[PDB]
Amino acid sequence: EQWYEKFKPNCLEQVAIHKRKLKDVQEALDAMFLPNAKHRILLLSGPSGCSKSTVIKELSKILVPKYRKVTEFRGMESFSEFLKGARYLVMSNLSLILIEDLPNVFHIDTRRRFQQLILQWLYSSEPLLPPLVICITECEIPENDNNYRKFGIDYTFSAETIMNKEILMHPRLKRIKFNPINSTLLKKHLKFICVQNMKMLKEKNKWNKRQEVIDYIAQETGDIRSAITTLQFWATSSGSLPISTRESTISYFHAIGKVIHGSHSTNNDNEMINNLFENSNNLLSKEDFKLGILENYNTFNKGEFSISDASSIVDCLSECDNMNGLPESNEYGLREVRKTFRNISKQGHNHGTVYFPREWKVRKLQNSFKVQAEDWLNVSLYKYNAVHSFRNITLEFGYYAPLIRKCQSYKIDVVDRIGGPIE
Amino acid sequence: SLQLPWVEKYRPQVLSDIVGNKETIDRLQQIAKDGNMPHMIISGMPGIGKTTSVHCLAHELLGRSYADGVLELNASDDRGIDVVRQIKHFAQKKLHLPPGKHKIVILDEADSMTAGAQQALRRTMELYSNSTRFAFACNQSNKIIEPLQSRCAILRYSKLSDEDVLKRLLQIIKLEDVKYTNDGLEAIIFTAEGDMRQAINNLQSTVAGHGLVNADNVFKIVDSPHPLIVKKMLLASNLEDSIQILRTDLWKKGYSSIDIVTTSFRVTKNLAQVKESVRLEMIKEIGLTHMRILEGVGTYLQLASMLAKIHKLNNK
Amino acid sequence: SKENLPWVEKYRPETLDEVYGQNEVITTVRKFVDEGKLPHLLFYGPPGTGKTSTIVALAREIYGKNYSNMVLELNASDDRGIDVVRNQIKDFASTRQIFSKGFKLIILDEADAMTNAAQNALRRVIERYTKNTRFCVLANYAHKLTPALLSRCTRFRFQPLPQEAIERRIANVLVHEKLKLSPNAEKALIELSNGDMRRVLNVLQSCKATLDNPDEDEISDDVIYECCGAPRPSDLKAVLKSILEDDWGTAHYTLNKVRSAKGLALIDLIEGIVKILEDYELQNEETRVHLLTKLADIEYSISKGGNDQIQGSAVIGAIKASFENETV
Amino acid sequence: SLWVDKYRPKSLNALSHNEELTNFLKSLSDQPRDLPHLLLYGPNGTGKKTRCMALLESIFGPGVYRLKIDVRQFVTASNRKLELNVVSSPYHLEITPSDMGNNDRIVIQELLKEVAQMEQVDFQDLAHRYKCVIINEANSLTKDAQAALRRTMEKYSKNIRLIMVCDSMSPIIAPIKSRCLLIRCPAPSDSEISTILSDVVTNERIQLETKDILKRIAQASNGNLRVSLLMLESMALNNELALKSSSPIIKPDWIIVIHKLTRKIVKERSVNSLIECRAVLYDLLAHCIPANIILKELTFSLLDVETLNTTNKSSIIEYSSVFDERLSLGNKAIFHLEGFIAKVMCCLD
Amino acid sequence: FSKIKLPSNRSILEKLQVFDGDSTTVIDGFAVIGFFDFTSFDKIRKSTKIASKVLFRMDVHGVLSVNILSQPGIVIEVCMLEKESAQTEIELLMET
Amino acid sequence: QQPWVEKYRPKNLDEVTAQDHAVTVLKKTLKSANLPHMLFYGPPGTGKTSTILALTKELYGPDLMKSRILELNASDERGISIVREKVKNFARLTVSKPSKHDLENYPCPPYKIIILDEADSMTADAQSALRRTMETYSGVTRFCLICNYVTRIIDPLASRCSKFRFKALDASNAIDRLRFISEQENVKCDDGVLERILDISAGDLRRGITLLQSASKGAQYLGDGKNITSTQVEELAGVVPHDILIEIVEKVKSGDFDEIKKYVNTFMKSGWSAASVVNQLHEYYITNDNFDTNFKNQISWLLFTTDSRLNNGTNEHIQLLNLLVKISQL
DNA sequence: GATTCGTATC
DNA sequence: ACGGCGG
DNA sequence: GATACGAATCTTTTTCCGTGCCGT
Numbered sequence A: 001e002q003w004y005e006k007f008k009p010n011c012l013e014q015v016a017i018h019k020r021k022l023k024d025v026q027e028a029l030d031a032m033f034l035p036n037a038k039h040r041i042l043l044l045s046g047p048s049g050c051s052k053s054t055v056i057k058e059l060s061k062i063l064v065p066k067y068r069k070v071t072e073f074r075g076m077e078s079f080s081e082f083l084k085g086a087r088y089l090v091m092s093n094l095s096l097i098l099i100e101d102l103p104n105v106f107h108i109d110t111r112r113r114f115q116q117l118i119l120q121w122l123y124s125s126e127p128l129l130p131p132l133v134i135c136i137t138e139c140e141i142p143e144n145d146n147n148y149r150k151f152g153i154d155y156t157f158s159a160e161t162i163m164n165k166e167i168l169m170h171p172r173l174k175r176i177k178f179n180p181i182n183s184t185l186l187k188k189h190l191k192f193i194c195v196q197n198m199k200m201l202k203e204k205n206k207w208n209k210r211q212e213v214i215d216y217i218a219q220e221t222g223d224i225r226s227a228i229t230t231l232q233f234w235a236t237s238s239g240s241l242p243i244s245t246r247e248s249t250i251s252y253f254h255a256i257g258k259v260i261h262g263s264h265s266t267n268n269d270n271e272m273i274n275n276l277f278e279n280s281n282n283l284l285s286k287e288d289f290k291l292g293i294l295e296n297y298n299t300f301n302k303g304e305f306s307i308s309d310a311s312s313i314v315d316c317l318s319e320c321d322n323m324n325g326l327p328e329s330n331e332y333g334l335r336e337v338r339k340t341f342r343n344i345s346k347q348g349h350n351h352g353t354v355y356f357p358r359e360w361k362v363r364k365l366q367n368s369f370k371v372q373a374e375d376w377l378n379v380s381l382y383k384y385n386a387v388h389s390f391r392n393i394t395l396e397f398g399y400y401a402p403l404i405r406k407c408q409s410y411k412i413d414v415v416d417r418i419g420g421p422i423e
Numbered sequence B: 001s002l003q004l005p006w007v008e009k010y011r012p013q014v015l016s017d018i019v020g021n022k023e024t025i026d027r028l029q030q031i032a033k034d035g036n037m038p039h040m041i042i043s044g045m046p047g048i049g050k051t052t053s054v055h056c057l058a059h060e061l062l063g064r065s066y067a068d069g070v071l072e073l074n075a076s077d078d079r080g081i082d083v084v085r086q087i088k089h090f091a092q093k094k095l096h097l098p099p100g101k102h103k104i105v106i107l108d109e110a111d112s113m114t115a116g117a118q119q120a121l122r123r124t125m126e127l128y129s130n131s132t133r134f135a136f137a138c139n140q141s142n143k144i145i146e147p148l149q150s151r152c153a154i155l156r157y158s159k160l161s162d163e164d165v166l167k168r169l170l171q172i173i174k175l176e177d178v179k180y181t182n183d184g185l186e187a188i189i190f191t192a193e194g195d196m197r198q199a200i201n202n203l204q205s206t207v208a209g210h211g212l213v214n215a216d217n218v219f220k221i222v223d224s225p226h227p228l229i230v231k232k233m234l235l236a237s238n239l240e241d242s243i244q245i246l247r248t249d250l251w252k253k254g255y256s257s258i259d260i261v262t263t264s265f266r267v268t269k270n271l272a273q274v275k276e277s278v279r280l281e282m283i284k285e286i287g288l289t290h291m292r293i294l295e296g297v298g299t300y301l302q303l304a305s306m307l308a309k310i311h312k313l314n315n316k
Numbered sequence C: 001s002k003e004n005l006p007w008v009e010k011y012r013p014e015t016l017d018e019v020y021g022q023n024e025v026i027t028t029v030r031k032f033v034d035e036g037k038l039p040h041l042l043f044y045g046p047p048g049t050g051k052t053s054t055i056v057a058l059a060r061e062i063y064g065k066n067y068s069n070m071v072l073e074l075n076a077s078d079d080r081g082i083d084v085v086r087n088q089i090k091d092f093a094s095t096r097q098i099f100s101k102g103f104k105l106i107i108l109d110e111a112d113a114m115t116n117a118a119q120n121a122l123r124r125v126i127e128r129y130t131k132n133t134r135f136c137v138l139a140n141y142a143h144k145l146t147p148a149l150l151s152r153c154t155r156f157r158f159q160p161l162p163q164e165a166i167e168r169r170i171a172n173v174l175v176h177e178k179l180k181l182s183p184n185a186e187k188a189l190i191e192l193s194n195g196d197m198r199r200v201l202n203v204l205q206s207c208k209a210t211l212d213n214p215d216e217d218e219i220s221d222d223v224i225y226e227c228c229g230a231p232r233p234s235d236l237k238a239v240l241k242s243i244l245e246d247d248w249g250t251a252h253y254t255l256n257k258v259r260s261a262k263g264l265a266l267i268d269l270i271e272g273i274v275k276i277l278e279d280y281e282l283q284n285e286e287t288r289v290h291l292l293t294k295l296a297d298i299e300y301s302i303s304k305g306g307n308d309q310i311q312g313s314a315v316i317g318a319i320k321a322s323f324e325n326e327t328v
Numbered sequence D: 001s002l003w004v005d006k007y008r009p010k011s012l013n014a015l016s017h018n019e020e021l022t023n024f025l026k027s028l029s030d031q032p033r034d035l036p037h038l039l040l041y042g043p044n045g046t047g048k049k050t051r052c053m054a055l056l057e058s059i060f061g062p063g064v065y066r067l068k069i070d071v072r073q074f075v076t077a078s079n080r081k082l083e084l085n086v087v088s089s090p091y092h093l094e095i096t097p098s099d100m101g102n103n104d105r106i107v108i109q110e111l112l113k114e115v116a117q118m119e120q121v122d123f124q125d126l127a128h129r130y131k132c133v134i135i136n137e138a139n140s141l142t143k144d145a146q147a148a149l150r151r152t153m154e155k156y157s158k159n160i161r162l163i164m165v166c167d168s169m170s171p172i173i174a175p176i177k178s179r180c181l182l183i184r185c186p187a188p189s190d191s192e193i194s195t196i197l198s199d200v201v202t203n204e205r206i207q208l209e210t211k212d213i214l215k216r217i218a219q220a221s222n223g224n225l226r227v228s229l230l231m232l233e234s235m236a237l238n239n240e241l242a243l244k245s246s247s248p249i250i251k252p253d254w255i256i257v258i259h260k261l262t263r264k265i266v267k268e269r270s271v272n273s274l275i276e277c278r279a280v281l282y283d284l285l286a287h288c289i290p291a292n293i294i295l296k297e298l299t300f301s302l303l304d305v306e307t308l309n310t311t312n313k314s315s316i317i318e319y320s321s322v323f324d325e326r327l328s329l330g331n332k333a334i335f336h337l338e339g340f341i342a343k344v345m346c347c348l349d
Numbered sequence E: 001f002s003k004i005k006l007p008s009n010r011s012i013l014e015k016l017q018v019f020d021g022d023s024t025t026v027i028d029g030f031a032v033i034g035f036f037d038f039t040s041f042d043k044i045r046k047s048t049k050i051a052s053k054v055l056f057r058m059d060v061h062g063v064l065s066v067n068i069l070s071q072p073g074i075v076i077e078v079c080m081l082e083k084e085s086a087q088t089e090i091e092l093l094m095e096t
Numbered sequence F: 001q002q003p004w005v006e007k008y009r010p011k012n013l014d015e016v017t018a019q020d021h022a023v024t025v026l027k028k029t030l031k032s033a034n035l036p037h038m039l040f041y042g043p044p045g046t047g048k049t050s051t052i053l054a055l056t057k058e059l060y061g062p063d064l065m066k067s068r069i070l071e072l073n074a075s076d077e078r079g080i081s082i083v084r085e086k087v088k089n090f091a092r093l094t095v096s097k098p099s100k101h102d103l104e105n106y107p108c109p110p111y112k113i114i115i116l117d118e119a120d121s122m123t124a125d126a127q128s129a130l131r132r133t134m135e136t137y138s139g140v141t142r143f144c145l146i147c148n149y150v151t152r153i154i155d156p157l158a159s160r161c162s163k164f165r166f167k168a169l170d171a172s173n174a175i176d177r178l179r180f181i182s183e184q185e186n187v188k189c190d191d192g193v194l195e196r197i198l199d200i201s202a203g204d205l206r207r208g209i210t211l212l213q214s215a216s217k218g219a220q221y222l223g224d225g226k227n228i229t230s231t232q233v234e235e236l237a238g239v240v241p242h243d244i245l246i247e248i249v250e251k252v253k254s255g256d257f258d259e260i261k262k263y264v265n266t267f268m269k270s271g272w273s274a275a276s277v278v279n280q281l282h283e284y285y286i287t288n289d290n291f292d293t294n295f296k297n298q299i300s301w302l303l304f305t306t307d308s309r310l311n312n313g314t315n316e317h318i319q320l321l322n323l324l325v326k327i328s329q330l
Numbered sequence G: 001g002a003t004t005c006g007t008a009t010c
Numbered sequence H: 001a002c003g004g005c006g007g
Numbered sequence I: 001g002a003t004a005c006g007a008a009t010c011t012t013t014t015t016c017c018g019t020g021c022c023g024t
Ligand SMILES: Nc1ncnc2c1ncn2[C@@H]1O[C@H](COP(=O)(O)OP(=O)(O)OP(O)(O)=S)[C@@H](O)[C@H]1O
Pocket: A003, A004, A005, A007, A008, A009, A014, A015, A016, A047, A048, A049, A050, A051, A052, A053, A054, A055, A137, A189, A224, A225, A228, B146, B147, B148, B150, B151
């Protein structure tokens, strides 16, 4: 049929996966096939076409007939009925259950049901359970049709957003992140396919010029399936049809690094910025990206650059923060940051490591402070007929009121600085 | 009341009448004859032949079974996850096709589909790949999720050149025996800006209005693309000429100030021979003017001030 | 009946004869109507230029007594979401036209307010039922319409109305209302309109109401400036001359006296001075930049309010400053 | 209770820190039937709320200080259930729409409109005839709740009256100020604060050693009576019922943190110093301290350094003004709070 | 492709008469085809629920006029437009 | 009774002072029936709402108003949904039949009026959804838009609405009305007063009547039967005394940054408004003859920038100190 | 995209 | 007459 | 023995998908 379906691996050695990752997956899987196995779930996450399920199928074609099929799901509570009958696959029915089919997680209700049902699976009191494996493909979700929801699963389709922290942190859940197929494996396999089609490629007179495309494809995509599809399309072609492969999305920190340091592929700042906006406007249009720029522009040279440049960068960021959510604001801010870091960049710089903004922690602390202040206010209102504005609680009482209400206690009420101390 | 517009009257019915993308069209004809058409994603800009080529491919491939073989779905039709769960019965249908032929599911405007629909389309494309094939047609390929693009062969249609527009215009003219001159057709191509549909519409309007396709008659009913007048205004040396363009060719012609500002933003993004610092300063000034326009001050003085600031940051 | 209507609605054109100013588009659409083929049209231009009137008169010369069964007019006052496009427009296009006047027409007035999903869904309704229906799109801002929608629509640009068209229509209104207008008053009216028919009609109605004896009483330029509350040309010239030549105190006093004589606002004076400044022969080219930047800032601040006495002094300072670099 | 509440004046004759203003309030309360809408503005802690409560007592007699809390809930434009504390009195009402955030519009359009629509007539009804509603922190209304008040208090003024307490009237729109009578509440002089503290220590046992330390309290409070009494109780509790001249004038922790930030900025001017300044600013903001106050105190601590020349101070104040304007028209405060610091240490170098 | 065929007996189908678009000349062997959207066609279900006899009439312009009489009771007139438009499939299914 | 602002509100169109260019037109409408769509814009407290209410009262009367008038203001929701359903349905309504009393006493025009007060607060989509609602039903329904900033009204809507600008009420056109209120409230004032009230109240008669009411309240309270002086009205308004202004400007003349810093620190405790002191400084610095052209040119822009920053809702200590420092370095 | 550790291989 | 067909 | 390569880490607070009436 199709090369990515006709040349599918028949053994693990034909699977395009790294040796160490393969070892980790193998040992984890075998440990999940033990009578009382610490780990109940195996959440494999990664980009598309990284042999996430290919390797699982091959491994369950060996492990299953050793301690005992893959029983794949077919995507409100239909998944409940499926999993209500996916637990009887016990010994003599041990059949690694693979959930590559995700019950619709773009819908709030069945997303919560998916999460709260996999939790019940995690906390099940049954003494014997089948090895549960979930494959989630990390793919940025494009810009919708004006969707004003703009929720978590409306920006990125990732495990973190489908599952809840507890699910992903549960001691009995093992997560093995997957990486794009390296060019070594990609060339090694795209050449095996060519020594199986050297006949047609010879009569086509492309068998001679095969390693050029085998290398260009291996350098353009980490997707094995897309690589094989592009190879099939080029081989069956006649003329000099352009070799185009699928397009992948950059990461958040990848985009930050591109803005700060740049990209080797392009030494043009304008072209790089325009392409980043064109292909990635679902992240370059979120305030967290500008917060990341502010938090990580000091990771250039480990923070050993002029103060004038830092002042210019932060001043521009502040100016663009009052330009509303306009498209020009980000295009100005990122361009200014890149220009500033381009003029000062040289050779000999041991750049630092970037980090995610801590604004979420500050917001959580603000919420905690609010919760603290409210108790003080109502206590006063019921015990001293006292109404105090939250502004005065945050500027005067938060500090004086607990000091007095504790010192008088020193000789129901608050004895500690409202919202914790200032450090 | 019986004539059809030239855009639809002369829509190609065979792959040999689709100008441009020579290599892509040749590949499509080869797929039409050989068979075994892969999953494809056809991107590009408006008016290039992304749907006139997928429909022609489906015609020349399925042929007589083009009624029970081509399940066409587009934005005008509902395409929720429920629809994707019409796309399952069509795939499960067994039809006796010639060897090498497969059913085609033409999902026009796949960039407007919901993500749940795409996540289910993956299931359909995985379970029924041996009987039916999917032909996505879109304007921006990034709107299709990466797992779907992984299973498909991406074919990007480039902008139609002036020669492939002139050749099709000459064919249509010989079929419609209209009168022309070289300068008129050059002006029609110039105003088309790589759009075949817009070129046909402009030629039809010029023929209806006057009959003779010359430069004057074309330009008195079709205006020169305003992005190019914005670019001319932004690249002026002194402020006199820039403000002069802004007034005569943009303000007195009826273009809205907000349209001018948005076009200026895009022009600046794609401007050449300008330093990066200058470009980002101009972007900032255009953003400030956009802010002022959106707040209510849609006046010519704001645009004049923006051009003055651009000149000020150019000359230093 | 039609005698208790505002002049902007009482004088709405009923046939393509009465639409003035836009000659090329009217000629083209008349030829399109006669030839019997009408493409998907898109009308673009400033507000009050005659787009709705033109399309409605065209759809009355194309249908007639069945202009209510053949034309489906949807505008911003109606919901035009994805469901509306998928159901109402699709069912209007799919059905048959009882053979009446060939194709059916769909007029989408104020399409710039339509969501992108609806415009994207309308693409395959425009080009599928083009054999039975023709779509017309009216919009003032072309940046809010998807490029695909612009591709499949024939673009006709409605220019701001020239002086001759305004003069002819003003003469029609005058004859129909038995009014007299002096040439200077007509100049002032055509200049204050800024290529707008609705402004012309409203100002003329206010002028008629201002006159004691609507008949036998003429509308001079003074009446126009009183009713519309705009500065006289002499007032703008006097304020500018005082700013340019006289000292700070005399200029401030003259500005205040001019504004208090007739309660003139500051924004209209700013605009009037801006035009004269645009006409000047400056020789430094930084005068122009400072003038434009400072006066735009002042106008924006005025748009948000504030001390109206600080802003006049700001204007005087901006002018003197800029016109000190001219002598540099 | 606290000495700020225990000694709070509870009548118009008990006010002793401004007599012209008290005479004006008495003149207003002599004929309560034609009382207009009032807007009390002045420095924080001068006693504006105390003066409002005294005026309400004077108009509606004793009965206004018996406050009880009512829980009132709304829903935003979408299905967002929201809660607002409503402390009410048999003769007046008090709400703080700023406590609910940007959605004070629904509060103003529902609670205030409902109270303004009810006539209050009780069998053919100055006292329990019209209603007084106090809007605390009228500055924090988001330019839209002030639009919904223009007609609410102009059309239904026969059965409701509005008296709002705001420190400063810059963020209040012109139409709102136009419909109301502006009442200015100047800060008390140091002598008046000293006299009030002397009265408190006379009714208390703090056992003062010199009446030149109460003057120190007054000078350190910068005209804030609540803060003055808070320090008085602080020292009179930490130093026992004894206030020696060596007793330490206690200042808020965030103030000394801002002073440490100032000293760090003056000493170290480098990118790493900038990052530590950002960390300290984040710590301050984690305590819900408003960013405009942070910027104001940082600027006025930078201007207090004796090692800076006039040009550095002028640049500092210019940057402070620019970044205060930016902060007002902004969404995230950290950007502007960091830009101000960066420019400051780019100028001092 | 589902079909519901009304019987030829006189109790269900009292009278069927096909004309050449003039309502005067009756001919046999020719069929008139009406392609209607069922969204509009379901609008007469609630009216047929109380109908004794229903009269169907269609002209060549593509207008179906459903006449419903109730038992005097109430008279209901529904006018329905025809789609643009499978015809050969219709003919082949009913010849089969 | 009631505040003098809600007690001297014009009841008919003859009580609306200072605005004849619009009141004359609206009065001529009474005899005719061709009232256009109206856009009332002007400074706050100029009489737009009073004018429209008087016109409505004179056109319909108390009985027919409840059926032929719809008023929507910023105190009620006016989103896109409300605009597209409620306003459209009211415009689509048929004109109610006037009674015999109404027809025999009031003109009773054959249309209704939709009054959209505070239309500047409406979103652009809501205003766009009004255009065809006004155009289609113009013969059975009329629209009146009231706003303070005409720029917040979209151009398409401003085109269909006749523009009536309400002038600012200064001491030269509103002195008669304030005098009438004074003589009808038995308010005794010195010569010069009732003009200083209108000078302080820049283009606002609502505030120039509230100030007079407060001055009269205080004067009645003191009880000496003496007139009200300019000093009293100034103090009540919030005007900074001239001596404090002279001290401020002497400190500015000195130039010392710390002296100015401490004087501003002690001045902000007095509670004076930044806008008022900025305005007084503007008057002083511009109308004086002891300063050169360049000084005035620079200070006009400085005051303009400070006023613009203050209008945005910023700290007044930072803005006043910066303005004074800048004025000290020119 | 950067650093750091760890292989695998020539 | 009772069972089945908001986030 | 050099080095290219590779893995880990650098993270979270308008439009569309689901759960009363008739037969025995
Ligand atoms: N050497 C190879 N190793 C692995 N897979 C191969 C190889 N050659 C062909 N394939 C095929 O490539 C495809 C890879 O699919 P997978 O990566 O397992 O699915 P995936 O990771 O879920 O990708 P997505 O996100 O679903 S599109 C399968 O159809 C394999 O049969």
